[PDB]
A paper describes a structure:
The most widespread of these mechanisms employs a “controller” (C) protein encoded by a gene downstream of its own promoter, and usually co-transcribed with the endonuclease (R) gene as a single transcriptional unit. The C-protein binds at various sites within the C/R promoter to regulate transcription of its own gene and the associated endonuclease gene. Unusually, in the RM system Esp1396I, the C-protein also represses the MTase (M) gene by binding to the promoter at the transcriptional start site, denoted OM where the C/R genes and the M gene are transcribed convergently from different promoters. Flexibility in this loop is very important for DNA sequence recognition, as it has been observed in the nucleoprotein structures to adopt different conformations depending on which operator site the protein is bound to.
The mutant proteins Y37F, Y37A, T36A, S52A and R46A were crystallized (the latter in two different space groups) and the crystals diffracted X-rays to a resolution of 1.5–2.0 Å. The KD for the R46A mutant was ∼30 fold greater than that of the wild type, showing a much weaker interaction with the OM operator site, and consistent with a key DNA-binding role for this arginine side chain. The ΔΔG for R46A is significantly larger (8.5 kJ mol−1), and that for the T36A mutation must be larger still, since we could not measure any DNA binding activity of this mutant protein. Both R46 and T36 of C.Esp1396I are seen in crystal structures of DNA-protein complexes to interact directly with the base pairs involved in sequence recognition, specifically with the G and C bases, respectively, of the C-box recognition sequence GTC. Five of the monomers in the asymmetric unit are observed to be in loop conformation I but the sixth more closely resembles that of conformation II, which is almost identical to that in the DNA-protein complex with the 19OM operator site. Both of the R46A crystal structures and the S52A crystal structure have adopted loop conformation III, despite the varying buffer conditions and crystallographic interactions in those three structures. The SO4 based interaction observed in the high-resolution wild type structure is also observed in the Y37A, S52A and monoclinic R46A structures. Both the monoclinic R46A and S52A structures show almost identical crystal contacts to those of the triclinic wild type protein, even though the space group and unit cell are different. The CC1/2 value was not determined for the monoclinic R46A structure.
Author numbering:
A (entry chain B), B (entry chain A): 2 to 79
The structure:
Amino acid sequence: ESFLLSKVSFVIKKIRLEKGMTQEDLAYKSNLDRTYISGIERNSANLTIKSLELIMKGLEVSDVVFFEMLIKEILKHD
Amino acid sequence: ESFLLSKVSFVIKKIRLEKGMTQEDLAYKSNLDRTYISGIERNSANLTIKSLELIMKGLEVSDVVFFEMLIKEILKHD
Ligand code: NA
Ligand code: NA
C-alpha cells in the first residue's frame, strides 16, 4: 500500500470517527456494506470513484473538504 | 428498557468510539465475542459485572472514569 492508498483509508476513518460514526452507520449511510467499509479502511486500492462519492455522502463531507484533508495529510506527512 | 440499562450501553459505545475502536476491536481486547459486544450495546440487561470489568479493560478505561461518565449521563439526562 503506497502512502496515497493508506492515507485515503486514513482520512475516511478519521472523518468517520470525528463524526462519531461506527462502520455500520457509515455502511448504512453510504449504501456499501459493513465488510466493504472495513475492507476499504484497511486497503483502499480497489475503492472506485463512485464508491468514494457514496462514502463522502455517507460522511456528510463535501468532496472539496475530503480532498483538502487528503492533500494536507500528504503534504505534512509524506 | 430503563434509562440505566440504556445508558450503560450508551457509555460503552461512546467510549469505544472515543477510543477509535470497532466492535471487533473491542471483542478482541475484552475477551468477549463480537455478537456479545453488539448485543450488550443494544441491551445491557444481561451484562454481568465480570463482563463489564472485561469491557472496561478492553476499552482501557478505569472503572472510576466509567462510572463517573455513567453518573454524568444519568444526572444530565434522566
Ligand atoms: Na468500489
Ligand atoms: Na451493533
